[PDB]
Each structure stands twice: as C-alpha cells, then as structure tokens.
From a paper:
The YopM_34–481 construct essentially consists of the LRR region and the two N-terminal α-helices that initiate LRR folding. The crystal structure revealed four molecules in the asymmetric unit. The asymmetric unit contains four molecules equivalent to two biological assemblies each represented by a dimer. Analysis of the interaction interfaces between the four YopM molecules indicated that two YopM molecules mutually interact by binding of the C-terminal LRR 20 (residues 461–481) of one molecule to the internal LRRs 14–17 (residues 342–422) of the other molecule. The total interface area comprises approximately 1010 Å2 and is mediated by 21 hydrogen bridges. The crystallographic dimer fitted the experimental SAXS data reasonably well (χ2 = 4.3), which could be further refined to a nearly perfect fit (χ2 = 2.3) by using a rigid body modelling to slightly change the angle between the two YopM molecules. Altogether these data indicate that a dimer represents the smallest biological assembly of YopM and that the dimer creates an interface that allows binding of one molecule of DDX3, thus forming a 2:1 YopM:DDX3 complex. It appears that the YopM dimer forms a binding interface for the DDX3 fragment. The first part of the binding interface covers an area of around 1000 Å2 and is formed by LRRs 7–9 of the first YopM molecule (green colored in Fig 3D). YopM's highly conserved unstructured C-terminal tail is not part of the previously published crystal structure or the novel crystal structure obtained in this work.
Yersinia outer protein M (YopM) is a major virulence factor of the three pathogenic Yersinia species, Y. pestis, Y. pseudotuberculosis and Y. enterocolitica. Together with up to six other effector proteins YopM is translocated into host cells by the bacterial type three secretion apparatusand significantly contributes to the Yersinia infection strategy. The individual LRRs in YopM consist of 20- or 22 amino acids and together form a LRR-domain, which makes up the central and largest part of the protein. YopM isoforms of all three pathogenic Yersinia species were found to associate with the serine/threonine kinases RSK1 (p90 ribosomal S6 kinase 1; MAPKAP-K1) and PKN2 (protein kinase N2; protein kinase C related kinase2/PRK2).
Author numbering:
A (entry chain A), B (entry chain C): 34 to 481
Amino acid sequence: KSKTEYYNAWSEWERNAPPGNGEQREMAVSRLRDCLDRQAHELELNNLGLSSLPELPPHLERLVASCNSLTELPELPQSLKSLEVYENNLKALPDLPPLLVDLRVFNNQLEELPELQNLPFLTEIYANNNSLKTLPDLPPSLVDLNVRENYLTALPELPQSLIFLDISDNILSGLSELPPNLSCLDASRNGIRSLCDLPPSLVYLDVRDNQLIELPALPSGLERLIASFNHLAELPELPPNLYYLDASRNEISSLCDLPPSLVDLNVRKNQLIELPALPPDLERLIASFNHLAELPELPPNLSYLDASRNEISSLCDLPPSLVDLNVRKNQLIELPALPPDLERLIASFNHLAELPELPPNLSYLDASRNEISSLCDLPPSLVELDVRDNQLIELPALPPHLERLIASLNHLAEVPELPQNLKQLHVEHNALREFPDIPESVEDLRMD
Amino acid sequence: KSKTEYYNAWSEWERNAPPGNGEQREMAVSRLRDCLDRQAHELELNNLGLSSLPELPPHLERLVASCNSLTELPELPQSLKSLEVYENNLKALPDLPPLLVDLRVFNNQLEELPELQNLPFLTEIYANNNSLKTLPDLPPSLVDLNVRENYLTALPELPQSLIFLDISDNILSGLSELPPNLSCLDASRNGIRSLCDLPPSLVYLDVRDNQLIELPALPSGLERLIASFNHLAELPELPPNLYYLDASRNEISSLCDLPPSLVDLNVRKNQLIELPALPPDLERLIASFNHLAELPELPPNLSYLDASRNEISSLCDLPPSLVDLNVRKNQLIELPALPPDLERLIASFNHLAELPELPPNLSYLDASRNEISSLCDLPPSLVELDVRDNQLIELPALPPHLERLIASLNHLAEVPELPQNLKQLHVEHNALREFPDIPESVEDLRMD
C-alpha cells in the first residue's frame, strides 16, 4: 500500500466507531499517521478503549495496544519484534511474524496460541491468565515462559534454553521432565502427584498446593523450597545452600537434619513429635499445629518463634535476639525469663498462674485463658493487653500509651483509671462494683 | 541608611551559624537582597532553620518567617502590614508598627504580648498555643481573635468590632461580657462556671468541658450549640434556627421541645427517662447512656441512631432512611423489620431469641450476648460478624467476603467451610467435634 491508502483505511475505521462512545479513535489515527510519517519503531495505543485495530503500518518493530477492549487483531507486519496486547478480550491471535522476540498477551480470553515452533527469535512468552487448554510446541530459544492461571492439562517438550517457568494454577497432574538450565519453577495450585528429576541449575522451587507424597532429590544449588499443602510423609535430604524452607500443611512425621545455611523454617500443621537440632543462623521458626513435647535449644539469632497449638510442657531458655514469641495452646505452667528485646508475647491457653517480669519494650501481650491470679507491673511500652478468661480480681496501674484492654471473663471488682487515649475496653463478665469513667477516646466499649 | 550597608550586615550575619550547619542563611541573604533590590512587598524566609534574623529591609509590608527556630525578632519596619512567625521559639515580640493588620504568632513560647491598643488597623490576631498568662488591652477594630491553648485566667474588654473569638483550653472561670457582633465563640476546656448574656448575633457556640449548671437564653440566630461535659440540669428553650445540638455528658433530667430545624442531636450520658417528639428533618440521634424506656416515633430522614446503654424493652418502626443502628444493652426481646439500606447493626446485650431477615446491604453485624438459638441466612454484603455468647449449635453458610467471624461462647458442633479471604476467626468455648480447615488468609485465630 501507498501512504494515502493507509490514511483512507484509518479515517474509514475512525468512523466505524458510532458517534458518541468511549473510544479515542481520533487520538489513535493521530498516532498511526505520526508513526507512518516518521517510520517510527514503536506504536503505542494503550488505554484508548478500542474494540478493534485497523491495518497496521508496516516496518514497525513494537506494537503496544494493552488495556483496551480488543476482540481480535489485524495481521501483524513482518518486521514486528514485540507484541504487548495484555488486558484485552482476545479470543485468539493472528499468525505471528518470524522476527518476534516478546509476546505479552496475558489477561485475555485466548483459547489457543498460534504455531510457536518456527519463531527462533522468540525468547519470552507471557500468556498467563487466559483460557488455554493446551500449548503448541514451543520456540527453540525460549528463555521465559509464564502460563499461570489457565486450564492446561499437559505440557509440551521444554527447550534447553528455558530458565524461568511459571505453570501454576492449572490442571496439571504430572511433570515428565524439566530442562537442565531451569533456575526457577513455580508449579503451585495444580493437581501434581509426582515430580521427576529436578535439574541442578534449579534455585527456586514452588510446588505449594499439589498432591505429592514425596519430593525427588533436591539440587545442591537450591536456595528456596516451598512445598506447602501437599501430603508429604517426609522431606528428602536438604541441600547445603537452602536458606528458606516452607513445608507446612503436610503429614511429616519427622524432619531430617537441617543445613547451617537455613535461616527461615516453616513446618506448621504436620505430625511432628520433636524437632531436630536447629542451625545457628536460623532467624524464623514456625512449628505450630504439631505434637511437640518440647523445643530443642534455640539458636542465638532466632527472632520470631511460633510454636503454638502443640503440647509443650516446658519452655527452654529464650535467646536475647527474640522479638516475637507465640506459644498459644500448650501445657505450660510457667514461662522462663523473657528476653529484653521482646515486643509481642502470646502465651494464651496454657496453665499459667503468673507471668515473668515483662521486658520494657513489650508492646503486645496476650495471656488470656490461663489461671492467672494477679498481673505483675506492666511496662509503659505496652499498647495492647489481652487477659480475658483468668482468675483476676484487680488489674495493675495501666500504662498511659495503652490502646486496647481486654479483660473480660475475670473476677474484677473494679478497673484502674483508664488511659486518656484508650481505643477499646472489653470487660464483660466480671464483678465490677463500680464502673470506671470512660475516656472520649474509647470507640469500642463492652462492659458489665 | 544605604544599600551596601545592609549588604554588609547580612553577609556578617551569614557568618556564622554553628553547629555548621543546620541553617540556610545563604539562601536567606539571597532573598533579603532580592527583596531590597526589587523593593518587594513580601519577604518569605520560612523553613530555613534560622536561629535569628538580621536587620530587615525597610519598606516591606509582609514578613513571613514561620517554621524556623527564632528566639526573638529584630525591630520591625514601620511599613509592615502583616507578620507570620508561627512555629518558632519566640519568648517575646518586639514593639509592633502602626500599620499592622495580621498577627500570626501561634506555636511559640510567648509569655506576654506587646501593647496592642494603639494598632487601629490590626484586625486579626492568632496567638494560640503560647504561654500567655494575660492579654494586653486589644485593638479598637479587632475582628478575629484566637488565643486558645494558653494560661489565661481573665479577659480584657472585647471590641464592638469582634466577630470570631477562640479562647478555649485556658484557665478561665467566667466570661467578661461579650460584644454584640460576635458570631462565633469557642470557650471549651476552661473552668467556666457561668455565662452571662449571649449576643443575638451569635451563631456558633462551643462551651464543651466547663462547669456550667445552666445556660443563658439562647439567641434566635444560633445554629450550632455544643455544651458537652458540663453539669447541666436542663437546657433553656432552643431557638428555631438551631440545627446541631450536642449536650452530652451532663445531668439532664428532661429535654424541652426540639425545633423542626434540628438535624443532629446528641444527648448521650444524661439522666433522661424519655425523649420528646423528634423533628421531621432529624438525621442523627445519639441518646446512649440514659434511662430510656422507649423511643418516640422515628422521623422519615433519620440515618444514624445510637440508643445503646438504656433500658428499652420495645423498639418501634424503623424508617427506611436508617443506615447505622445501635441498640446495645437494652431489654429487647425482638427487633422489628430492618430497613433495606441498613449497613451496620449492633444489637448485642439484649434478650433476642432470633434476628429478623437481614437486609442485603448489611456489612457489619454484632448480635452477641443474646439468647439466639439459630441464625437466619447471611447476606453476601456481610464483612464482619460477631455472635459470641449465644445459644447457637450451627452457623449458616458464610458469605464469601466475610473478613471477621467471632462466634465464641456458643454450642457449635462444627463451623461451616470458611471464606478464602477471612482475616479473623474466634470460636473458643464451643462444642467442635471437628476443627475446620484454616485459610492462609486468617492471621488472628482463636479456637478450642
């Protein structure tokens, strides 16, 4: 086509929008002409509310037409190197030109993709969030593939060249093989029943929410493993570079040894009776919802500990690095000395008769559902106090920066003078002979 | 005298400003010279962190030097019409020039003000938040005075010309007779024991948090009255233009008639046994913490009602305009039909056996501490549900956009499948035969 032949086709397309609607076709034709006149490489038509596109200017390398309401596309020029048409209503794509490198077609209604095996320059496909039931055979040199949130039931052969692969939230039931250069795999939210070998190049592996009984041998290179919400009976041996492990909501009976590189562990909601020796550099331990009789000696750098919902009868020495401690629902009769930098303590649902001396940086304290007869002095740093369901007849003087006081289901005869910036006061089910004066600041009051 | 004499004084003042250097003196001398060179009216030196100012350019009308660390000021030029030096550390002011019109010296440590009676052009003084024990005699033509947050124990004579007056948060115990043009008075947070006469021109009156037994006659012009936190036994007759009344936290035994112009009423925390007939155009009624046996018929436009902490045994017809209803802590055995546009219902602490059909726009529901045996169907609009302390054995299907579920202290045998974006689940003290699966989303969990 000559130059004025395009000008006609585009001015004709400009009228096929009915007079008075949301489409900025006049702005689009302005850009189409500017692009043709200057032989520009890029053409961006995004956020103009288009239902269709006219014949595209040839000799362009990049077409961005995302965030519109397109139903299909016109044939693509042969010079085209990248295509960005995400956030549209595309049910299918045209045939793709040979020089193509990027394909971004996520957030559409694509039911199929065109033939991909003959686009050797195509290195990135983001076709996530579509209605794809199946993938055609992939390009030779594909580096990045994202096809999450689709209805895939099986996978084609994956290239040697492949590095990043997201196939999560599909209907996969197995993975036959992975390429040797894959460094990052997300296969969450499928129905996968078994993995085959993992390549040594792998460093991030996320298989959350599948139906595994066991994992294959893990690469020594592997750094982060997420294997939550499966039916794991045990973990395989863990590599020496693994620093983050989440194996929660499985049926693990016992852990193998943990490497010294491990800094973050989560084995919540399993069948553990005991933990093995924790590594020195561990900073975050979650071991809730298990059957723990006791914890092993805690490492010097541990800063967050959640050992709730267990049957721990005795709590060992707490390291000074600890800042967040939760031991709700255990068999505790006493807590040990609380470390100075502690900020949040949750020791509810045990058999405590009293609390240790509270450290001076404690901002949140929940010691409800114990048999506590009186409260030790409260630090001024305290903002939230929950001591419902205990054996209290009186509360100590309340710190001035307290915002929430919950002390219902006790035997309180009176409440102390209330802080002037208290937000919440819950003292139902008590023996109050006199009700306190309520600050203007309290917005959520329950009493008597 | 001359131009280069100022240039010297300012370059001398520029050296020096230790601890070198929290002060932008070089930027300030730049503006001082630009101001002198161009004979400009304004000079702004705010947010430059100055500890002092040098000799000012004469022939300027406006000096803005707020948000600095000034301890005193240089003598002010005679041409000066306005002064803005708030947010500083001024302990005193210089003598003020005759042509002055605005004085903004709030947020300082001023212990006294200079002689004001001889500045006839001075029409606005904002000297609030200082350490003033006393005011000098005021200008003849003063229109606006703000001296809130000071240590005043008495007031000088107020001009005829005075319109707006804020004297709140001081140590006043009585009021020096008010001028006849005053349209707006705030005398909150003093120890005022008695008001004398209010001028007819008055339209806004705020005497919150004083020690009044009664109010003088109110002007017919009066539109908004705040008289909270006093010892009022009764209100005087209310004028026909009054649209906002807050008489909460007093000792009122009964209300007089309410004018039809009244749109917002608050008589919380009084000694009321009944309310009088509500006006048709009322939109907001707060009558909490009283001894109400029943409410009168509610007007068609009432949108917010808080009649909590009373002894109401029967609740009359609720108008469709109602959106926010709170009847916590009364003698209710049943609720009437809930209007369609209702969004928040709080009916906790009554004797309810069941709830009416919940309207479809209800987002927050608290029906705790009743004797409810089963819950009617919950609308999908519901985000927060509190039904603790009731006679429930099961919960209905939970709407999908529920974020908080509190159903502790019941007889629940099981909980329904939980919404996937639930934040809080509190179901302690129940009969759960099996515990539900906990979504990843729930961050605050309490259960048996």
